[PDB]
Structure 1
Amino acid sequence: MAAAVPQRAWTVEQLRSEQLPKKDIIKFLQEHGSDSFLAEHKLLGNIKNVAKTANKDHLVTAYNHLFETKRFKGTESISKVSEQVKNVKLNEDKPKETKSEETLDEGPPKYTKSVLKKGDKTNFPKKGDVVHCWYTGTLQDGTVFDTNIQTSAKKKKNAKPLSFKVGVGKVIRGWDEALLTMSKGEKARLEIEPEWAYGKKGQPDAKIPPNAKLTFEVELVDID
């Protein structure tokens, strides 16, 4: 399993624009949305064939609400090699494993980060300096625990990124280590373990059970 809440990759001004290829916007919703979701706007199927049925605003309108309706792509096939059930033993609850077995030799921290869309790659957050970005959290099963992705301002002035100083015990130790490597105008998807978030106990406050992996995506907007 691997598909947390993806952050906005494009902008309303870009999509609707006449410089961005609709071919992509269609492939993005297909990899970030579920069949049913796409079916609604007839976005599922064949892009080449959908690019004729789906209009410019059609692709953008479906890319905007997708986040508002939080109806991203869900489990359908995922990874599956086999299924075994031991008789009287009790061991593991989830399929686990992932075929490949080699992430590092020394041992990575208690989290995983992946830069989706590279940004400035120069203006990094310094200790003591504030930062403004968005973030959408979702449990292993995709349970939203914290979504700062407010509505767009173009439709109504009511959106303001969260401003917090880095390296000042503002956020979790796992997010601080990941965000600290974020660049101005960049999108990423990092998953922090329960050891560097809430703990083995969990977070009953947000219906978060013990040992729950938290994956999300952030988008840096500015750094002061």
Structure 2
Amino acid sequence: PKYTKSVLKKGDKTNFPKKGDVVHCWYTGTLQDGTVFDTNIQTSAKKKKNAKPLSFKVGVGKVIRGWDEALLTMSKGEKARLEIEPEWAYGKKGQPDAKIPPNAKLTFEVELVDIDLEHH
């Protein structure tokens, strides 16, 4: 498969994003060697009432393929470890600014915090 998902914390098994919904996520991205290339989890004395999760419309190409596909399988509250093959991430180009090399399998911890039913 082009990604794998391991559930770290079960969601509500009830509310799954549909294409066109807006999802709200916390994440940490790592390379296979363990290098953290990004996180939106704030470590400054900021937390609640300062930092906001990442919001995007799901299933329409706004994120790398691995995320767009995996999110549709997650329920609200779920925290999962996604291992995304390069073709469903940054492929041959990589991403120079984030120091992601060509052909990089990416690991993301993703927590789906909320869903707005924008598919309506």
Q: TM-score, normalised by structure 2?
A: 0.87
Relative distance call for 1:149 and 1:120 in structure 2 (3 A) is: same
Relative distance call for 1:153 and 1:133 in structure 2 (3 A) is: farther
Q: Deviations over 1:102-146 (max 9, x none)?
A: xxxxxxx21111112111011001111111110100111112222
What is the identity percentage for the equivalent residue pairs of Structure 1 and Structure 2? Answer: 100
Relative distance call for 1:152 and 1:179 in structure 2 (3 A) is: farther
Distance of 2:7 and 2:37 partners within structure 1 = 22
Relative distance call for 1:125 and 1:210 in structure 2 (3 A) is: same
Tell me how many residue pairs correspond in the alignment. Answer: 116
| 2:15 matched residue in structure 1 | 123
Distance of 1:191 and 1:161 partners within structure 2 = 21
Distance of 2:97 and 2:78 partners within structure 1 = 30
Deviation at 1:184, TM superposition (A): 0.6
Q: TM-score, normalised by structure 1?
A: 0.48
Q: RMSD in angstroms over aligned alpha carbons?
A: 1.9
Task: Select the structure of larger CA radius of gyration.
Answer: 1
Relative distance call for 1:156 and 1:187 in structure 2 (3 A) is: closer
More strand by share: 2
Relative distance call for 1:183 and 1:152 in structure 2 (3 A) is: farther
Q: Deviations over 1:168-209 (max 9, x none)?
A: 211111111111101111110011011111012322221121
More helix by share: 1
Deviation at 1:152, TM superposition (A): 8.0
Distance of 2:48 and 2:63 partners within structure 1 = 29
Deviation at 1:151, TM superposition (A): 4.1
